[PDB]
């Protein structure tokens, strides 16, 4: 029995998400102190995100960008940082290196987009912008989504300095020094990734699909906030608890 009716049952919390707060922001912070913003309980339009041509290293892994509007996700964890112009290959699952291992690590089962633009007018001063920062020397390989905000002095060879910088003692947090005379491998990249999760929580945040009023016991093709299937909707006596 083919479905003779397709119904849409997205929730109607019609207030929009603050992607303008996330994307159009003055101060994206550094890769050692990348900012997390929780996006929930709103309608999120990703068509203006994909249709904007300012991005050049988009590369959404696991979810295709055109078919992204019609599912509904549990949570958006908007991470945002500024890196060098050759380290977006480090911002990917599987790849290891300086930015990937010692600054920000993605999960191996990562599902999300790697949205970034190239900003040379904004984040480069003639002379060098010196508080955009990155960590080289660290005695711990980071598990994904970790915070290394500590400014402890690193000891390498034998004797611990423990509070001073000197022989075999390097400070971990060193500046980029972004100048506009640099090439495209040294230009600032403002990388803002959107980590999602499919099945861990209630599905909340998604696109502007217009909901359709429900119909009864004829076999229909339903869309209940991201799960698509064909079947018969019938009244039930199953005591669903509110979680």
């Amino acid at each position: 029995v083919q479905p003779t009716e397709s119904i849409v049952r997205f929730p109607n919390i019609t207030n929009l998400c603050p992607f303008g707060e996330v994307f159009n922001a003055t101060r994206f912070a550094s890769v050692y102190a990348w900012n997390r913003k929780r996006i929930s309980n709103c309608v999120a339009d990703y068509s203006v995100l994909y249709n904007s041509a300012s991005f050049s290293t988009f590369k959404c892994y696991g979810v295709s960008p055109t078919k992204l509007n019609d599912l509904c996700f549990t949570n958006v964890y908007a991470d945002s940082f500024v890196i060098r112009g050759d380290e977006v290959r480090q911002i990917a699952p599987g790849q290891t290196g300086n930015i990937a291992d010692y600054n920000y690590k993605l999960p191996d089962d990562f599902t999300g987009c790697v949205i970034a633009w190239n900003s040379n007018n904004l984040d480069s001063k003639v002379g060098g912008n010196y508080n955009y920062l990155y960590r080289l020397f660290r005695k711990s390989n980071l598990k994904p989504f970790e915070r290394d905000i500590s400014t402890e002095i690193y000891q390498a060879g034998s004797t611990p300095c423990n509070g001073v910088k000197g022989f075999n003692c390097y400070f971990p947090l060193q500046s980029y020094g972004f100048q506009p005379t640099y090439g495209v491998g040294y230009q600032p990249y403002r990388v803002v990734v959107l980590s999602f999760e499919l099945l861990h929580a209630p599905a909340t945040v998604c696109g502007p699909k217009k909901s359709t009023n429900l119909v009864k016991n004829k076999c229909v093709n339903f869309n209940f906030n991201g799960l698509t299937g064909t079947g018969v909707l019938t009244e039930s006596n199953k005591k669903f608890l509110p979680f």
Partner: antibody, heavy 118, light 107 residues
Framework: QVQLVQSGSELKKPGASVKVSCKAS????????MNWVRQAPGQGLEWMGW????????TYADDFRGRFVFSLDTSVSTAYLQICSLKAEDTAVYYC????????????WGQGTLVTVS | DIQMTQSPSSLSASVGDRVTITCRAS??????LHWYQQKPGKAPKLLIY???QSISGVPSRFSGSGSGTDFTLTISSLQPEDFATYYC?????????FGQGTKLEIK
């Protein structure tokens, strides 16, 4: 002395194209950006855009995206705005601002070209 | 895009009193406000940057404070020669959006 000398009062037809000036002296022109603002007489400050002082790309605000062009000339410290195809709703005074890439607090200082349109 | 309203629009004040005026933003601007004046026929002058700190070289008859979206400044000693329309300036999200202005009036 740090000051931003601004051109005189313009008065033209709704459809002409003029070019006001913002000439600066005293500070490092390369270090800071070159913000701009308008004054409707029954309203307040309204921003249009910043200009990087090494290349001069004309990025604007989200409202005034159209016929408005900023043109910076390097090594002479001139920061020309060119307004083209003026309308009757552009009876505003256009101050000039020093607004950097990092700081974004103004200390705005301009004499104000009294652009009256009729 | 930050729809900033500020209240009250036109308020009266007296000599040597203490008045409190507020500037409110719709979205989160959590610690970024800059405060201006507008005398007629005069370019604006900055007082308070990043909503707590004051600029060097201003007469300190005032202070600014606040967190979240509820921001204010308080005149601790008012003088009649100011009568300036107070302007608030956000610096978090583009575009740089200003306020309408609280005009100070003497009786």
């Amino acid at each position: 002395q740090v000051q931003l000398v601004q051109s005189g009062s313009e008065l033209k037809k709704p459809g002409a194209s003029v070019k006001v000036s913002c000439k600066a002296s005293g500070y490092t022109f390369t270090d800071y950006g070159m913000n701009w603002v308008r004054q409707a007489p029954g309203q307040g400050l309204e921003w249009m855009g910043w200009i990087n002082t090494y290349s001069g790309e004309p990025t604007y605000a989200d409202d005034f995206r159209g016929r408005f062009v900023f043109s910076l000339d390097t090594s002479v410290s001139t920061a020309y705005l060119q307004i083209c195809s003026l309308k009757a709703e552009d009876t505003a005074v256009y101050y000039c601002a020093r607004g950097g890439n990092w700081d974004w607090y103004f200390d705005v200082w301009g004499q104000g070209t009294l652009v009256t349109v009729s | 895009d930050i729809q900033m309203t500020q209240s009250p629009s036109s308020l009266s004040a007296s000599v040597g009193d203490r008045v409190t005026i507020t500037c409110r933003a719709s979205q989160s601007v959590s610690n970024f406000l800059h405060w201006y004046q507008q005398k007629p026929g005069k370019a604006p002058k900055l007082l308070i940057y990043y909503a707590s700190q004051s600029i060097s070289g201003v007469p300190s008859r005032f202070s600014g404070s606040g967190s979240g979206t509820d921001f204010t400044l308080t005149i601790s000693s008012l003088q009649p020669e100011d009568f300036a329309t107070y302007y608030c300036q956000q610096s978090n999200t583009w575009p740089l959006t200003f306020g309408q202005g609280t005009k100070l009036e003497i009786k």
